[PDB]
Amino acid sequence: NGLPSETYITCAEANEMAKTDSAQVAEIVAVMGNASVASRDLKIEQSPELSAKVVEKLNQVCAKDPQMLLITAIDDTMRAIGKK
Incomplete structure (x- = not known):
């Protein structure tokens, strides 16, 4: 009933x-x-180059899939780049 902001918002809108x-x-x-x-x-450190890109690519994913809620989209991207 009480959906968190980051759960109800899409990463595309987050870019907005x-x-x-x-x-x-x-x-x-x-x-x-x-x-x-x-x-x-x-083993992943606080690399600013990772965040800068984790949102850059993220919003592009949401641009193709509006169902990519921010809360999930970030976890999903972590899955993609979580194996380097």
Whole structure:
């Protein structure tokens, strides 16, 4: 009944927000993103080059699939780049 913002919002729309609040979106994708990636690998460090791209490619995925909720989309991207 109480759907969290990041659960009800799509990464494509998160990109839209970035036009108004880039730091807000970059922070969110970094917070759970860094934790998420480190939860499956644990060797992944706080690399700014990873976040910068984890959102760049992410919004493109949502642009093709609007059903990619932000909360899931980040985890999904962590799955893709979670094996380097």
